[PDB]
Amino acid sequence: TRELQSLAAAVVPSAQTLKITDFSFSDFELSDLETALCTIRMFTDLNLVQNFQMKHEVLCRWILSVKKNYRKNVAYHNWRHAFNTAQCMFAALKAGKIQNKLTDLEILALLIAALSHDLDHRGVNNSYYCHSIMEHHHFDQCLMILNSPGNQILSGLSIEEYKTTLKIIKQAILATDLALYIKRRGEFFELIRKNQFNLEDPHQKELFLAMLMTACDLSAITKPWPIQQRIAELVATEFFDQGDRERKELNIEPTDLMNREKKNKIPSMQVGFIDAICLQLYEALTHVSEDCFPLLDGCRKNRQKWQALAEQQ
């Protein structure tokens, strides 16, 4: 296609130029093309392109097939969110110094997962066990693209590597199910507290990758105020949209979280979301690597902003 040709023939700026190394990065002013290029730089600077012999044109096609499988009519869960999640993973890996703590395969799997964790999301969200029905679909969507002719970016891996990578990609994507996050963080938080976290432990490694995925998945809550407020409104829109739709089809009354009115409650709930789900996670991550402080730091500053709004409301 023409789009593919443009992407595969364009020059890929340096990560520095793209500014994708900093946690404060923002996509809002970038074109789709620019996000695809950033994505290429991501796979490139993580040495995934050469270490795994990815064919440029195939990588390009795969990036487009993934972007393509996201629905733009969905307010928040679209390509951009997937892209920002991967941008954060890249940032955390580089600026957060998390890269030296993982293997190339773990890294390859995480990048792919971040980009694919919400594939074909329809805008139907949950609340807080649902058995990760949605994430299973996202994975199925990810595998499908990874196997489609011309998009096989994983060809080049041995059979054992492919098997390993696939297993990790699946756990990564399923880990983006908040219910599983809540189900597992307790143990993760205990270790960090008792000061006995050990990445050398296979189980503790998996646990970490899961916490990492959810951390990147929620990265918006850590971005600078202007960006956070903007994305927050996208989240709200999708929820309200779901509340209205859910009431249209089924005669169901939306919980305040999904009801369009009571929108003056977002500051209050954003503070609640941050307290109950984000802060502990980003703080704990800082104990793994102090270079991830910006994430924690950005989360706190947002809680102050939302708190001001709630009182002032």
Ligand X SMILES: CCCc1nn(C)c2c(=O)[nH]c(-c3cc(S(=O)(=O)N4CCN(C)CC4)ccc3OCC)nc12
Is there a binding annotation on residue 81? yes
Check: CB of residue 300 under 8 Å from CB of residue 281: no
Nearer to ligand X, 152 or 307 (CB): 307
Residue 276 binding ligand X, by CB under 6 A: yes
Part of the chain binding ligand X (CB under 6 A), chosen from 51-59, 61-69, 195-203, 218-226: 218-226
Positions 156 through 215 that interact with Mg ion (CB under 5 A):
176
Active-site option among 56, 77, 131, 136: 77
The one-character DSSP state at 290 is G
134 has which bridge partners? none
Residue 220 binding ligand X, by CB under 6 A: yes
Residue 89 binding ligand X, by CB under 6 A: no
**What residue has token string 């029905």?**
133
Cβ-based neighbours of 250, under 8 Å, separated by 6 or more: none
Q: CA–CA distance from 2 to each of 7, 9, 64, 72 (Å)?
A: 9, 10, 12, 20
Spatial separation of the C-alpha atoms in residues 200 and 166, rounded to whole Å: 21
Q: Which does 235 bind (CB under 5 to 8 A by kind): Mg ion, Zn ion, ligand X, none?
A: ligand X
Residue type at position 301: K
Residue whose Cβ sits closest to ligand X? 272
CA atoms within 13 A on the CB side of 192: 19
Residue type at position 81: H
157 has which bridge partners? 155
Separation of CA 172 from chain center: 10
Nearer to ligand X, 69 or 222 (CB): 222
Which residue of 65, 125, 155, 289 would you call a contact of ligand X, by CB under 6 A? 125
Residue 221 binding ligand X, by CB under 6 A: yes
Six-digit token string for 209: 């990758």
What is the smallest separation between the CB atom of 272 and ligand X, expressed in angstroms?
Answer: 3
Is there a binding annotation on residue 217? yes
Cβ-based neighbours of 242, under 8 Å, separated by 6 or more: 123, 124, 125, 254, 258
Six-digit token string for 6: 């443009």
Part of the chain binding ligand X (CB under 6 A), chosen from 33-41, 97-105, 136-144, 271-279: 271-279
The one-character DSSP state at 278 is I
Six-digit token string for 189: 């938080």
Is there a binding annotation on residue 203? no
Residue 135 binding Zn ion, by CB under 5 A: no
Active site residue 136: no
Check: CB of residue 183 under 8 Å from CB of residue 131: no
Spatial separation of the C-alpha atoms in residues 256 and 263, rounded to whole Å: 8
Is there a binding annotation on residue 131? no
Residue 266 binding ligand X, by CB under 6 A: yes
Is there a binding annotation on residue 270? yes
Residue 118 binding Mg ion, by CB under 5 A: yes
What is the smallest separation between the CB atom of 237 and Mg ion, expressed in angstroms?
Answer: 16
What is the smallest separation between the CB atom of 85 and Zn ion, expressed in angstroms?
Answer: 6
Nearer to Mg ion, 58 or 178 (CB): 178
Binding positions for Mg(2+) are 118
* Interface contacts to ligand X, rule CB under 6 A: 125, 218, 220-221, 232, 235-236, 257, 266, 269-270, 272-273, 276
* Interface contacts to Mg ion, rule CB under 5 A: 118, 176
Binding positions for Zn(2+) are 81, 117-118, 217
* Interface contacts to Zn ion, rule CB under 5 A: 118, 217
Please identify every residue annotated as catalytic. Answer: 77
Binding positions for 3',5'-cyclic GMP are 270
